[PDB]
Amino acid sequence: SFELPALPYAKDALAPHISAETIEYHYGKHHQTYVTNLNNLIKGTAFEGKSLEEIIRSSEGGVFNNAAQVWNHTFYWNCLAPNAGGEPTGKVAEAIAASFGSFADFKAQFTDAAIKNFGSGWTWLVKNSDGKLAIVSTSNAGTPLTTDATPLLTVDVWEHAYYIDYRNARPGYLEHFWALVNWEFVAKNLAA
Amino acid sequence: SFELPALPYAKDALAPHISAETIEYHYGKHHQTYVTNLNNLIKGTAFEGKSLEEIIRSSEGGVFNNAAQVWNHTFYWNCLAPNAGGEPTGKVAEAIAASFGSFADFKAQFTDAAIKNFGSGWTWLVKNSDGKLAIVSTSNAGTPLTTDATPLLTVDVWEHAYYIDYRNARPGYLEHFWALVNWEFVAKNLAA
Ligand SMILES: [Fe+3]
Ligand SMILES: [Fe+3]
What we know:
Helix content of chain A: 40-55%
Number of strands of chain A: 3
Family (chains A, B): Belongs to the iron/manganese superoxide dismutase family.
Bound molecules: fe (iii) ion
Cofactor (chains A, B): Fe cation
Number of helices of chain A: 8
Distance between the termini of chain A: 27 Å
Pfam family, one (chains A, B): Sod_Fe_C
Catalytic activity (chains A, B): 2 superoxide + 2 H(+) = H2O2 + O2
Organism (chains A, B): Escherichia coli O157:H7
Order of helices and strands of chain A: HHHHHEEEHHH
Oligomer: homodimer
Strand content of chain A: 5-15%
Largest interface: A-B, 18 and 19 residues
Structural class of chain A: mainly alpha
Number of domains of chain A: 1
Strand order of the largest sheet of chain A: 2-1-3
C-alpha cells in the first residue's frame, strides 16, 4: 500500500498563484484517486513488493499510469513553496547559466516548452547522465524516471492544474509558476 | 483560410448539462484558437486550398493537431442539441441494437470507454468498413478520419470540456452528455 504524502504547506499558502480550491481538487481528489487506483491495481500482484520507483520502471498500462502520476505529483508539490520563486543562487544558478547561457534564457525556453506541450503532460528540467541540464516534455503520465536523466523541476500542464484559476490561459499559469518555484528542492535534486 | 463555423444553437441552449460559460471558453476561446493556429501554419504551403478532411488525412505534427481539432469540435457541437437526448428510434436504434445488443448496453460501453480514456482525447461511435458499429477512443487530436471507419458520434473528454461544470467528475459529464445527443445528426452520419 502507498499513501498520499502530506502536502508540504497549508492549502492556501500558494495563493494567489495557485488557489486553495485548485489544491483541494488537484491534491485532495486527483492525486488521492491515483493513490487509491494504484493500490487497487497492484493488490495481490508481484508489484506489491516493490518500491514506487521500481514499479514505474517495470510496468505498463494502468499500473504505470497511476504509479507514475503518484510520483510525479508528489515531486510537483515539492517544487512549489510560499515565499520562494525569484532567481536561484548557488550551484543551481551556475548549472543553469552553464547549460542555457542565463536564467532568463532558461526561463524563456522552459515556458515555451510548457506552453507547446500538446494535450496533457509535464515539462521537466533534468540533469542528463553527462552532467548537462536539459528541458524535456512528456505526455500524460510520462516521466524522466524511465530514462537515465535525473528530474530536477517539473510543471504539471494537464488542464486540471490551472483551469480553475486561469481557464484556457496556460501562459498565465506558467508566469505565476515562476513565483512559486522552490529552488531549495531543485538544489537538493541537483546535488544527489 | 478556414472560418470558425457558427454554433447551431445559442450559447446557453445546452444549459444546465453544459453551461453557457463552458461554451464561451470551449467554443469562443479553445476552438477559435485551433482555427487561428491552423490558418497561420498553412499560409503559403501546399495545404492552403485543400479541404479540412484532405489536410487531416495527409499531415502530421502541428498542422495535423490543429486541423483535426477544428474538425473534431465542429462535429462535437453538431452531436449536441437542445430538446434532444433520450433513446434513438429508426435506423440508428436498429444499427445500435444489432451491434451492441441494446441501447442500454451501448450507452454503458460508450460511457465506460469515455471515462477510462486516459488523458486528453475523444471517444467515438464509428461505422466500420464492414457496416458494424464500434466504439473507439483516440488520444489528443486523433480522429477516425485517418482510418476507414465513418464517425457517427463523439464526446470530447479533454478536461476543458467539463471542468468548469463538473470539475474532476467526468462520470457526471457523461451522464449529462446523454441528455444532449442529437440523434438526427447521428442518423445523417450513419447514412453517409
Ligand atoms: Fe495533475
Ligand atoms: Fe475540446
